[model samples]
Target: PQVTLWQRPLVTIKIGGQLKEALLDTGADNTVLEEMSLPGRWKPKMIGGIGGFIKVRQYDQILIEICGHKAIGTVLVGPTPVNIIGRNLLTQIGMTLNFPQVTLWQRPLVTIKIGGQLKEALLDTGADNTVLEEMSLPGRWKPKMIGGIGGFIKVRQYDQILIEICGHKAIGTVLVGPTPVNIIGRNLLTQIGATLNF
Candidate 1:
């Protein structure tokens, strides 16, 4: 019953144990259920996206089933244009499978906090902007696209989060995409007075 993100980052998941196909719109902050009549006491919340904003039913600690695994977390049930999976559920699934492949030991390691946990990230001076694990950051973010060695992927840029690297601490905009590795870009490095060295 293990599902996967394939071809074009789309997935069929069972939320609250109900089966449905959700596009992997990891750019958004919350998991959006398209047209589902969810029964619960929920707050009316406006969530942001590439288009603009949409009013939805925000339910907290909703049991989510993805990749044949169950997750306890927040889920949105409302009028989304389509059923899509966002960071709210992506992190749980990724964390469960150890996420697949990553990079090397040549890169510098930096420590930072994400999803309420302290984690070590790869310092990448080559990158112009710092990129974080999208599923870990909190709140709805304004969606944008960031390009690197690859083409570009839609991500939400969130601010005000402190990033600590090599004893240097500062906060900067972090892009959250479907990136498997946490990249601490020059934005943080410049604040810490650190530069790329051979």
Candidate 2:
């Protein structure tokens, strides 16, 4: 099953015979959920929370079923706004995140503004960062290599680039490379307040 950037990338997950809803957060390094009861040996720890620093209970080697795929990894219980299945568990799932409402080959492309130029780009939830093709960005940039459904590609990382999506403005790093198509990944997706649905 795949998801689209039509709403929040919320998915159904199961643990300890109980079901819960969580977001597939590729940007987050660890998985954190609202305080809940589970059968396990938990260790107390403090993490630099997204909203702020918060204490949490850490449970390890727990089996969590994400979108019907089974995976076992560490789970964090804390004061998170919503449950998040970050990189830790996402890597274990090894799922290809795409979309519906159209054929898989034909993804929905949105018009975005970068450097006062209107460009057609894909609002890809599966991508962790945005990549623009055939565009030369200003300012200092470093060589970067990023991976995707096709594999790894070299790109130039221009940090703090102002981009306007659907009339919403935000600053984020835009990667310029030889991609077949311009990709609007989660980094800019969150900035413009976009999420996934279904």
Candidate 3:
């Protein structure tokens, strides 16, 4: 399926012979599914993300068919608004989430200009916000916190800022903080009209 940046990247998944729709949530570290019956011994666990923490049942070595590809991984059974197929299993599927769709194993890097400075950033479809390594910027910024696969981090928010990416320009909120890498997330990708084609 080919999906635009603004649309949810949903795909059909087959688990235990049952078919369900799941979102390809790149931002998540683990695959999480709504409560359902599965044959296995499970352990109780907790995972934290954008919101807070939620208790979940962890089932290991579960086989799942994503779209047409099959892989095995730990699937967390919990109450969630949507079923998510995260990177834990996504990496095993051997495909790239391409914009207008291209297949590759290497990371997608694009040149971008922020605050009149040029930098390279990963085109991250899983990330929700554009985050850069520590840098000084003009204007007022508020301290903000966001959560991801590993955990949360303190960030400085600069709203209504202009950035140029791949010859495209967009004005939106950009966060500056101690991120492991510079990422161009969905926030800016939508403005650049990127999409996922698989």
C-alpha TM-score for every candidate: 0.45, 0.54, 0.67
Order the candidates by TM-score, highest first — what do you get? 3, 2, 1
lDDT of each: 0.59, 0.72, 0.79
Q: How far is 83's C-alpha from truth in model 2 (Å)? A: 0.6
For model 2, the stretches where C-alpha displacement exceeds 4 angstroms are: 96-198
Model 3 CA lDDT for position 74: 94
lDDT of 1 at 144: 86
Give residue 103's error in model 2 in angstroms: 22
> Could you say which candidate leads in TM-score?
3
Index of the highest-lDDT prediction? 3
Estimate, for each residue in 23-79, the C-alpha lDDT of model 3 and write its tens digit: 876556688988888887999999865445678899999999999989999999887
- For each of the candidates, the C-alpha root-mean-square deviation to the true structure, in angstroms, is 13.1, 11.1, 4.4
Residue-level lDDT of model 1, residues 1-198, one tens digit each, is 332322223456776547887654323445778767565788888775433466777888888676565677888777665676655566666522112222222234556765567877765433457776656677767888865322356888887777665456678788887665777765665666552111
Off by over 4 Å in 3: 16-22, 25-63, 68-101
lDDT of 3 at 70: 90
User: Could you give candidate 2's per-residue lDDT for residues 1-198 as a string of tens digits?
Assistant: 445454567889998788999877654567888878889589998775212367888999999999888889899898776788776777667633332232222344778889778999876554567888868566899998876422467888999999987667879899998777677887777776553422
